[PDB]
Short mmCIF file of N, CA, C and O in Angstrom, two decimals:
data_model
loop_
_atom_site.label_atom_id
_atom_site.label_comp_id
_atom_site.label_asym_id
_atom_site.label_seq_id
_atom_site.Cartn_x
_atom_site.Cartn_y
_atom_site.Cartn_z
N UNK A 1 98.65 -44.99 -114.73
CA UNK A 1 97.58 -45.65 -115.66
C UNK A 1 96.57 -46.44 -114.86
O UNK A 1 95.47 -46.54 -115.33
N UNK A 2 97.09 -47.10 -114.02
CA UNK A 2 96.36 -47.96 -113.07
C UNK A 2 96.62 -47.90 -111.61
O UNK A 2 97.52 -48.66 -111.03
N UNK A 3 96.22 -46.77 -110.91
CA UNK A 3 96.41 -46.63 -109.48
C UNK A 3 96.02 -47.72 -108.54
O UNK A 3 95.16 -48.56 -108.92
N UNK A 4 97.02 -47.81 -107.60
CA UNK A 4 96.87 -48.74 -106.64
C UNK A 4 95.70 -48.21 -105.80
O UNK A 4 95.58 -47.31 -105.39
N UNK A 5 94.57 -49.26 -105.62
CA UNK A 5 93.35 -48.95 -105.08
C UNK A 5 92.98 -50.33 -104.44
O UNK A 5 92.35 -51.04 -105.15
N UNK A 6 93.08 -50.44 -103.22
CA UNK A 6 92.73 -51.79 -102.50
C UNK A 6 91.17 -51.90 -102.36
O UNK A 6 90.73 -52.99 -102.36
N UNK A 7 90.01 -51.53 -101.94
CA UNK A 7 88.92 -51.27 -101.15
C UNK A 7 89.15 -51.78 -99.59
O UNK A 7 88.70 -51.21 -98.62
N UNK A 8 90.21 -52.74 -99.56
CA UNK A 8 90.52 -53.31 -98.44
C UNK A 8 91.53 -52.71 -97.92
O UNK A 8 92.37 -52.12 -98.74
N UNK A 9 91.81 -52.10 -96.65
CA UNK A 9 93.11 -51.98 -96.05
C UNK A 9 94.30 -52.86 -96.23
O UNK A 9 94.17 -53.94 -95.53
N UNK A 10 95.32 -52.68 -97.04
CA UNK A 10 96.33 -53.52 -97.00
C UNK A 10 96.24 -54.56 -97.92
O UNK A 10 97.25 -55.63 -98.10
N UNK A 11 95.55 -54.62 -98.77
CA UNK A 11 95.41 -55.73 -99.85
C UNK A 11 96.90 -55.59 -100.54
O UNK A 11 97.01 -56.54 -101.39
N UNK A 12 97.12 -54.67 -100.74
CA UNK A 12 98.11 -54.39 -101.71
C UNK A 12 99.36 -53.56 -100.83
O UNK A 12 99.14 -52.63 -99.95
N UNK A 13 100.51 -54.12 -100.92
CA UNK A 13 101.78 -53.48 -100.13
C UNK A 13 102.99 -53.29 -101.13
O UNK A 13 103.19 -53.80 -102.18
N UNK A 14 103.84 -52.29 -100.56
CA UNK A 14 104.95 -52.19 -101.26
C UNK A 14 106.24 -52.96 -100.67
O UNK A 14 106.26 -52.98 -99.44
N UNK A 15 106.95 -53.77 -101.34
CA UNK A 15 107.95 -54.41 -100.69
C UNK A 15 109.47 -54.25 -101.02
O UNK A 15 109.84 -53.75 -102.08
N UNK A 16 110.14 -54.31 -100.02
CA UNK A 16 111.60 -54.38 -100.13
C UNK A 16 112.15 -55.40 -98.99
O UNK A 16 112.03 -55.38 -97.98
N UNK A 17 112.93 -56.12 -100.01
CA UNK A 17 113.68 -57.34 -99.16
C UNK A 17 115.18 -56.85 -99.23
O UNK A 17 115.81 -56.98 -100.26
N UNK A 18 115.64 -56.20 -98.01
CA UNK A 18 117.01 -56.02 -97.74
C UNK A 18 118.12 -56.99 -97.70
O UNK A 18 117.82 -57.99 -97.15
N UNK A 19 119.17 -56.65 -98.26
CA UNK A 19 120.49 -57.55 -98.23
C UNK A 19 121.21 -57.27 -97.17
O UNK A 19 121.53 -58.12 -96.49
N UNK A 20 121.31 -55.99 -96.81
CA UNK A 20 121.91 -55.57 -95.71
C UNK A 20 121.44 -54.44 -94.86
O UNK A 20 120.72 -53.51 -95.60
N UNK A 21 121.12 -54.77 -93.50
CA UNK A 21 120.50 -53.70 -92.64
C UNK A 21 121.34 -53.03 -91.64
O UNK A 21 121.75 -53.90 -90.61
N UNK A 22 121.73 -51.71 -91.62
CA UNK A 22 122.44 -51.22 -90.63
C UNK A 22 121.49 -50.75 -89.61
O UNK A 22 120.29 -50.79 -89.37
N UNK A 23 122.17 -50.35 -88.42
CA UNK A 23 121.49 -49.73 -87.26
C UNK A 23 120.70 -48.46 -87.48
O UNK A 23 121.08 -47.72 -88.34
N UNK A 24 119.44 -48.57 -87.15
CA UNK A 24 118.49 -47.26 -87.29
C UNK A 24 118.16 -47.20 -89.02
O UNK A 24 117.95 -46.22 -89.08
N UNK A 25 117.91 -48.30 -89.41
CA UNK A 25 117.60 -48.36 -90.90
C UNK A 25 115.98 -48.07 -91.00
O UNK A 25 115.08 -48.50 -89.85
N UNK A 26 115.61 -47.69 -92.20
CA UNK A 26 114.15 -47.24 -92.32
C UNK A 26 114.14 -47.00 -93.67
O UNK A 26 114.70 -46.59 -94.27
N UNK A 27 112.58 -47.08 -93.85
CA UNK A 27 112.26 -46.64 -95.31
C UNK A 27 111.36 -45.34 -95.21
O UNK A 27 110.36 -45.45 -94.41
N UNK A 28 111.68 -44.38 -95.86
CA UNK A 28 111.03 -43.22 -95.78
C UNK A 28 110.06 -43.29 -97.33
O UNK A 28 110.65 -43.35 -98.47
N UNK A 29 108.72 -43.21 -96.98
CA UNK A 29 107.84 -43.41 -97.92
C UNK A 29 107.28 -42.22 -98.67
O UNK A 29 107.02 -41.33 -97.74
N UNK A 30 107.02 -41.96 -99.76
CA UNK A 30 106.29 -40.68 -100.47
C UNK A 30 105.27 -41.40 -101.43
O UNK A 30 105.55 -42.10 -102.17
N UNK A 31 103.95 -40.68 -101.37
CA UNK A 31 102.80 -41.09 -102.01
C UNK A 31 102.32 -39.98 -102.72
O UNK A 31 102.17 -38.79 -102.27
N UNK A 32 101.86 -40.07 -103.98
CA UNK A 32 100.80 -39.38 -104.83
C UNK A 32 99.64 -40.06 -104.85
O UNK A 32 99.60 -41.13 -105.30
N UNK A 33 98.22 -39.34 -104.51
CA UNK A 33 97.23 -40.02 -104.57
C UNK A 33 96.10 -39.13 -104.72
O UNK A 33 96.24 -38.08 -104.59
N UNK A 34 94.95 -39.91 -105.23
CA UNK A 34 93.68 -39.02 -105.41
C UNK A 34 92.59 -39.84 -104.37
O UNK A 34 92.86 -40.89 -103.90
N UNK A 35 91.73 -38.88 -103.91
CA UNK A 35 90.82 -39.48 -102.94
C UNK A 35 89.87 -38.39 -102.90
O UNK A 35 89.99 -37.28 -102.96
N UNK A 36 88.53 -38.84 -102.79
CA UNK A 36 87.40 -37.81 -102.59
C UNK A 36 87.35 -37.14 -101.34
O UNK A 36 87.66 -37.75 -100.41
N UNK A 37 85.57 -37.41 -101.62
CA UNK A 37 84.89 -36.93 -100.51
C UNK A 37 83.40 -37.29 -100.42
O UNK A 37 83.07 -38.00 -101.07
N UNK A 38 82.73 -36.98 -99.50
CA UNK A 38 81.28 -37.52 -99.36
C UNK A 38 80.25 -37.03 -100.18
O UNK A 38 79.43 -37.89 -100.50
N UNK A 39 80.19 -35.84 -100.67
CA UNK A 39 79.25 -35.23 -101.64
C UNK A 39 79.97 -34.19 -102.50
O UNK A 39 80.88 -33.53 -102.09
N UNK A 40 78.89 -34.15 -103.42
CA UNK A 40 79.09 -32.81 -104.50
C UNK A 40 77.85 -32.05 -104.56
O UNK A 40 76.77 -32.90 -104.62
N UNK A 41 77.90 -31.06 -104.52
CA UNK A 41 76.42 -30.27 -104.78
C UNK A 41 76.60 -29.22 -105.91
O UNK A 41 77.78 -28.55 -106.19
N UNK A 42 75.58 -29.13 -106.73
CA UNK A 42 75.10 -28.13 -107.70
C UNK A 42 74.22 -27.20 -106.92
O UNK A 42 73.15 -27.45 -106.72
N UNK B 1 75.77 -11.70 -107.57
CA UNK B 1 76.31 -12.73 -106.39
C UNK B 1 76.87 -14.23 -107.06
O UNK B 1 75.96 -14.73 -108.01
N UNK B 2 77.97 -14.56 -106.85
CA UNK B 2 78.05 -15.89 -107.24
C UNK B 2 78.34 -16.92 -105.99
O UNK B 2 79.16 -16.50 -104.96
N UNK B 3 77.71 -17.90 -106.08
CA UNK B 3 78.04 -18.94 -105.06
C UNK B 3 78.62 -20.28 -105.64
O UNK B 3 78.37 -20.70 -106.72
N UNK B 4 79.73 -20.78 -104.91
CA UNK B 4 80.66 -21.76 -105.27
C UNK B 4 80.52 -22.92 -104.64
O UNK B 4 80.81 -23.06 -103.65
N UNK B 5 80.30 -24.17 -105.22
CA UNK B 5 80.29 -25.32 -104.63
C UNK B 5 81.52 -26.11 -104.90
O UNK B 5 81.84 -25.84 -106.16
N UNK B 6 82.11 -26.77 -104.04
CA UNK B 6 81.53 -27.19 -102.78
C UNK B 6 81.81 -25.83 -101.50
O UNK B 6 81.65 -25.77 -100.69
N UNK B 7 82.48 -24.63 -101.90
CA UNK B 7 82.41 -23.98 -100.92
C UNK B 7 81.23 -23.01 -101.20
O UNK B 7 81.39 -22.04 -101.77
N UNK B 8 80.33 -23.19 -100.52
CA UNK B 8 79.23 -22.45 -100.54
C UNK B 8 79.15 -21.19 -99.50
O UNK B 8 79.72 -21.44 -98.28
N UNK B 9 78.53 -20.22 -99.91
CA UNK B 9 78.18 -19.15 -99.04
C UNK B 9 77.14 -19.54 -98.16
O UNK B 9 76.35 -20.09 -98.47
N UNK B 10 77.33 -19.06 -96.62
CA UNK B 10 76.73 -19.72 -95.81
C UNK B 10 75.27 -19.15 -95.94
O UNK B 10 75.21 -18.35 -96.67
N UNK B 11 74.43 -19.91 -95.60
CA UNK B 11 73.01 -19.71 -96.17
C UNK B 11 72.49 -18.82 -95.27
O UNK B 11 71.25 -18.56 -95.50
N UNK B 12 73.03 -17.88 -94.61
CA UNK B 12 72.52 -16.89 -93.84
C UNK B 12 73.47 -16.36 -93.18
O UNK B 12 74.21 -16.85 -93.01
N UNK B 13 73.48 -15.21 -92.37
CA UNK B 13 74.20 -14.79 -91.20
C UNK B 13 73.21 -15.58 -89.92
O UNK B 13 72.06 -15.24 -90.10
N UNK B 14 73.58 -16.37 -89.28
CA UNK B 14 73.04 -17.18 -88.45
C UNK B 14 72.96 -16.54 -87.00
O UNK B 14 73.28 -15.52 -86.58
N UNK B 15 72.40 -17.27 -86.15
CA UNK B 15 72.01 -17.08 -84.66
C UNK B 15 72.82 -16.70 -83.59
O UNK B 15 72.47 -16.51 -82.76
N UNK B 16 74.28 -16.77 -83.96
CA UNK B 16 75.42 -16.39 -83.13
C UNK B 16 75.66 -14.88 -83.23
O UNK B 16 76.38 -14.33 -82.72
N UNK B 17 74.83 -14.02 -83.89
CA UNK B 17 75.03 -12.75 -83.85
C UNK B 17 74.73 -12.23 -82.58
O UNK B 17 74.19 -12.61 -81.76
N UNK B 18 75.71 -11.04 -82.10
CA UNK B 18 75.88 -10.34 -80.72
C UNK B 18 74.88 -9.09 -80.91
O UNK B 18 75.15 -8.09 -81.52
N UNK B 19 73.72 -9.13 -80.04
CA UNK B 19 72.84 -8.15 -79.87
C UNK B 19 73.61 -7.19 -79.10
O UNK B 19 73.51 -7.49 -77.95
N UNK B 20 73.86 -6.13 -79.60
CA UNK B 20 74.55 -5.24 -78.55
C UNK B 20 73.92 -4.12 -77.72
O UNK B 20 74.48 -3.72 -76.99
N UNK B 21 72.80 -3.97 -78.09
CA UNK B 21 72.09 -2.83 -77.29
C UNK B 21 70.62 -3.03 -77.54
O UNK B 21 70.36 -3.72 -78.33
N UNK B 22 69.67 -2.07 -76.61
CA UNK B 22 68.39 -2.24 -76.71
C UNK B 22 68.17 -0.78 -77.13
O UNK B 22 66.90 -0.26 -77.17
N UNK B 23 69.08 0.21 -77.17
CA UNK B 23 68.92 1.57 -77.54
C UNK B 23 68.37 1.72 -78.91
O UNK B 23 69.15 1.69 -79.90
N UNK B 24 67.39 1.71 -79.00
CA UNK B 24 66.55 1.70 -80.43
C UNK B 24 65.62 2.51 -80.40
O UNK B 24 64.94 2.46 -81.14
N UNK B 25 65.47 3.24 -79.11
CA UNK B 25 64.37 4.21 -78.94
C UNK B 25 64.58 5.73 -79.08
O UNK B 25 65.37 6.37 -78.54
N UNK B 26 63.53 6.22 -79.97
CA UNK B 26 63.48 7.63 -80.14
C UNK B 26 62.45 8.13 -79.36
O UNK B 26 61.21 7.54 -79.61
N UNK B 27 62.74 8.84 -78.47
CA UNK B 27 61.71 9.40 -77.56
C UNK B 27 61.12 10.55 -78.26
O UNK B 27 61.60 11.40 -78.49
N UNK B 28 59.70 10.47 -78.62
CA UNK B 28 58.93 11.49 -79.12
C UNK B 28 58.96 12.70 -78.43
O UNK B 28 59.38 12.72 -77.28
N UNK B 29 59.04 13.69 -79.31
CA UNK B 29 59.22 15.04 -78.69
C UNK B 29 57.99 15.74 -78.46
O UNK B 29 57.26 15.63 -79.17
N UNK B 30 57.66 16.18 -77.50
CA UNK B 30 56.41 16.91 -76.94
C UNK B 30 56.78 18.42 -76.57
O UNK B 30 57.69 18.69 -75.93
N UNK B 31 56.30 19.44 -77.40
CA UNK B 31 56.71 20.82 -77.35
C UNK B 31 55.56 21.82 -77.38
O UNK B 31 54.53 21.68 -78.24
N UNK B 32 55.67 23.09 -77.03
CA UNK B 32 54.67 24.18 -77.08
C UNK B 32 55.56 25.33 -77.51
O UNK B 32 56.53 25.67 -76.81
N UNK B 33 55.26 25.93 -78.66
CA UNK B 33 56.06 26.96 -79.14
C UNK B 33 55.23 28.27 -79.61
O UNK B 33 54.31 28.07 -79.88
N UNK B 34 55.78 29.37 -78.95
CA UNK B 34 55.30 30.77 -78.83
C UNK B 34 56.23 31.86 -79.26
O UNK B 34 57.19 31.94 -78.60
N UNK B 35 55.76 32.47 -80.56
CA UNK B 35 56.58 33.62 -80.85
C UNK B 35 55.87 34.87 -81.10
O UNK B 35 54.86 35.18 -81.95
N UNK B 36 55.67 35.36 -79.74
CA UNK B 36 54.74 36.62 -79.70
C UNK B 36 54.89 37.90 -79.33
O UNK B 36 54.17 38.41 -78.67
N UNK B 37 55.92 38.35 -79.56
CA UNK B 37 56.36 39.85 -79.45
C UNK B 37 55.49 41.03 -80.14
O UNK B 37 54.92 40.51 -81.09
N UNK B 38 55.31 41.96 -79.45
CA UNK B 38 54.57 43.02 -80.08
C UNK B 38 54.92 43.26 -81.53
O UNK B 38 56.11 43.56 -81.64
N UNK B 39 54.07 43.35 -82.46
CA UNK B 39 54.73 43.71 -83.53
C UNK B 39 54.33 45.26 -84.05
O UNK B 39 53.08 45.64 -83.93
N UNK B 40 55.13 46.23 -84.42
CA UNK B 40 54.52 47.55 -84.86
C UNK B 40 54.46 47.90 -86.28
O UNK B 40 55.32 47.51 -87.29
N UNK B 41 53.31 48.28 -86.73
CA UNK B 41 53.09 48.29 -88.10
C UNK B 41 54.06 49.32 -88.90
O UNK B 41 53.66 50.26 -89.33
N UNK B 42 55.22 49.19 -89.20
CA UNK B 42 55.92 50.17 -90.14
C UNK B 42 57.33 49.63 -90.03
O UNK B 42 57.81 49.37 -89.13
N UNK B 43 58.09 49.77 -91.04
CA UNK B 43 59.65 49.63 -91.16
C UNK B 43 60.12 50.92 -91.71
O UNK B 43 59.49 51.58 -92.86
N UNK B 44 61.22 51.39 -91.51
CA UNK B 44 61.72 52.45 -92.19
C UNK B 44 62.69 52.20 -93.33
O UNK B 44 63.48 51.21 -93.16
N UNK B 45 62.58 52.59 -94.43
CA UNK B 45 63.44 52.37 -95.59
C UNK B 45 64.20 53.52 -95.98
O UNK B 45 63.60 54.82 -95.84
N UNK B 46 65.15 53.95 -97.03
CA UNK B 46 65.58 54.80 -97.64
C UNK B 46 64.60 55.05 -98.69
O UNK B 46 64.19 55.74 -98.71
N UNK B 47 64.37 54.30 -99.46
CA UNK B 47 63.26 54.48 -100.39
C UNK B 47 62.54 53.24 -100.69
O UNK B 47 63.22 52.46 -101.27
N UNK B 48 61.27 53.10 -100.74
CA UNK B 48 60.62 52.11 -101.42
C UNK B 48 59.77 52.73 -102.60
O UNK B 48 59.18 53.65 -102.07
N UNK B 49 59.06 51.96 -103.54
CA UNK B 49 58.21 52.35 -104.46
C UNK B 49 58.46 53.35 -105.21
O UNK B 49 57.71 53.86 -106.10
N UNK B 50 59.53 53.92 -105.58
CA UNK B 50 59.80 55.12 -106.24
C UNK B 50 60.37 54.61 -107.83
O UNK B 50 61.13 53.62 -107.69
N UNK B 51 60.04 55.21 -108.77
CA UNK B 51 60.42 54.96 -110.21
C UNK B 51 61.07 56.33 -110.60
O UNK B 51 60.78 57.03 -111.04
N UNK B 52 62.33 56.42 -110.27
CA UNK B 52 63.04 57.71 -110.35
C UNK B 52 63.45 58.00 -111.77
O UNK B 52 63.61 57.10 -112.77
N UNK B 53 63.40 59.50 -111.94
CA UNK B 53 63.71 59.79 -113.40
C UNK B 53 65.11 59.44 -113.79
O UNK B 53 66.00 59.99 -113.05
N UNK B 54 65.34 58.70 -114.98
CA UNK B 54 66.70 58.76 -115.42
C UNK B 54 67.07 59.99 -116.33
O UNK B 54 68.14 60.46 -116.44
N UNK B 55 66.16 60.76 -117.01
CA UNK B 55 66.24 61.92 -117.44
C UNK B 55 65.01 62.72 -117.51
O UNK B 55 64.15 61.85 -117.39
N UNK B 56 64.73 63.81 -117.16
CA UNK B 56 63.55 64.55 -117.46
C UNK B 56 63.51 64.99 -118.73
O UNK B 56 64.55 65.28 -119.36
N UNK B 57 62.44 65.39 -119.19
CA UNK B 57 62.21 66.21 -120.39
C UNK B 57 62.59 67.79 -119.91
O UNK B 57 62.52 68.00 -118.65
N UNK B 58 62.67 68.66 -120.86
CA UNK B 58 62.88 69.95 -120.67
C UNK B 58 61.40 70.49 -120.27
O UNK B 58 60.83 69.91 -121.03
N UNK B 59 61.23 71.42 -119.47
CA UNK B 59 59.90 71.89 -118.98
C UNK B 59 59.96 73.33 -119.01
O UNK B 59 61.12 73.95 -118.97
N UNK B 60 58.89 74.02 -119.14
CA UNK B 60 58.90 75.57 -119.09
C UNK B 60 57.56 76.02 -118.60
O UNK B 60 56.55 75.44 -118.69
N UNK B 61 57.43 77.36 -118.48
CA UNK B 61 56.42 78.28 -118.10
C UNK B 61 56.36 79.42 -119.34
O UNK B 61 57.36 79.13 -120.29
N UNK B 62 55.38 80.27 -119.58
CA UNK B 62 55.22 81.08 -120.59
C UNK B 62 54.55 82.53 -120.19
O UNK B 62 53.67 82.64 -119.36
N UNK B 63 55.06 83.46 -121.25
CA UNK B 63 54.61 84.86 -120.86
C UNK B 63 54.69 85.61 -122.44
O UNK B 63 55.74 85.62 -123.13
N UNK B 64 53.84 86.70 -122.64
CA UNK B 64 54.18 87.40 -123.40
C UNK B 64 53.86 88.75 -123.30
O UNK B 64 53.05 88.74 -122.74
N UNK B 65 53.81 89.77 -123.47
CA UNK B 65 53.21 90.83 -123.34
C UNK B 65 53.62 92.20 -123.88
O UNK B 65 54.78 92.30 -124.15
N UNK B 66 52.89 92.93 -124.48
CA UNK B 66 53.22 94.21 -125.09
C UNK B 66 52.43 94.99 -125.65
O UNK B 66 51.33 94.84 -125.47
N UNK B 67 52.65 95.96 -126.67
CA UNK B 67 51.71 96.49 -127.72
C UNK B 67 52.10 96.55 -129.02
O UNK B 67 53.01 95.92 -129.55
N UNK B 68 51.36 96.84 -129.85
CA UNK B 68 51.58 97.03 -131.40
C UNK B 68 52.03 98.51 -131.69
O UNK B 68 51.08 99.31 -131.89
N UNK B 69 53.38 98.73 -131.75
CA UNK B 69 53.81 99.97 -132.03
C UNK B 69 54.72 100.17 -133.06
O UNK B 69 55.32 99.44 -133.10
N UNK B 70 54.93 101.00 -133.95
CA UNK B 70 55.83 101.25 -135.00
C UNK B 70 56.32 102.54 -135.62
O UNK B 70 55.62 103.22 -135.77
N UNK B 71 57.61 102.55 -136.13
CA UNK B 71 58.21 103.90 -136.94
C UNK B 71 58.32 103.25 -138.27
O UNK B 71 59.00 102.18 -138.42
N UNK B 72 57.84 103.86 -139.35
CA UNK B 72 57.83 103.16 -140.71
C UNK B 72 58.35 104.41 -141.74
O UNK B 72 58.08 105.62 -141.56
N UNK B 73 58.89 103.99 -142.75
CA UNK B 73 59.59 104.72 -143.99
C UNK B 73 58.91 103.71 -145.26
O UNK B 73 58.99 102.32 -145.09
N UNK B 74 58.47 104.37 -146.15
CA UNK B 74 57.76 103.87 -147.33
C UNK B 74 58.59 104.23 -148.57
O UNK B 74 59.43 105.31 -148.68
N UNK B 75 58.12 103.40 -149.58
CA UNK B 75 58.77 103.53 -151.01
C UNK B 75 58.13 104.76 -151.62
O UNK B 75 56.78 105.26 -151.52
N UNK B 76 59.00 105.34 -152.61
CA UNK B 76 58.32 106.41 -153.25
C UNK B 76 57.33 106.02 -154.16
O UNK B 76 57.11 105.04 -154.80
N UNK B 77 56.49 107.26 -154.79
CA UNK B 77 55.71 106.90 -155.80
C UNK B 77 56.40 106.63 -157.16
O UNK B 77 57.40 107.09 -157.41
N UNK B 78 56.09 105.98 -158.06
CA UNK B 78 56.61 105.62 -159.20
C UNK B 78 55.57 105.65 -160.56
O UNK B 78 54.20 105.62 -160.21
N UNK B 79 56.13 106.07 -161.69
CA UNK B 79 55.39 106.22 -162.82
C UNK B 79 54.51 104.55 -163.05
O UNK B 79 55.30 103.59 -163.02
N UNK B 80 53.36 104.48 -163.30
CA UNK B 80 52.67 103.40 -163.76
C UNK B 80 52.96 102.90 -165.02
O UNK B 80 52.59 103.94 -166.12
N UNK B 81 53.42 101.85 -165.33
CA UNK B 81 53.79 101.19 -166.59
C UNK B 81 52.67 101.16 -167.88
O UNK B 81 52.54 101.77 -168.52
N UNK B 82 51.68 100.33 -167.32
CA UNK B 82 50.58 99.91 -168.19
C UNK B 82 49.38 99.59 -167.36
O UNK B 82 49.37 99.74 -166.16
N UNK B 83 48.32 99.20 -168.24
CA UNK B 83 46.91 99.01 -167.73
C UNK B 83 46.13 100.50 -167.66
O UNK B 83 44.96 100.58 -167.06
#
């Protein structure tokens, strides 16, 4: 309903504060988004 | 034709085309033609121009001849009735 849209790179971030971190830990992110383009012609 | 935006149909076949040949020329034909064999005035056919009879009429010639000759026998005389 209110998509994350920064104008600035990084104004907004997704946060995870881990309790325990094993060797080779990582976050695999997945995103759904809308984005244009430069022009539209009729 | 349909054009669809944003995928538009190129506005031409452009300048990247490969001219493949200069063979474009039809060489004009120049010629002198003579058909001159002696002609003889006649042809032979089985029949030309006839309107053959499908049936003829009957046809004839004529003759007569003779004389006037005769042998005769007559009725007898009778009594006359009246008058």
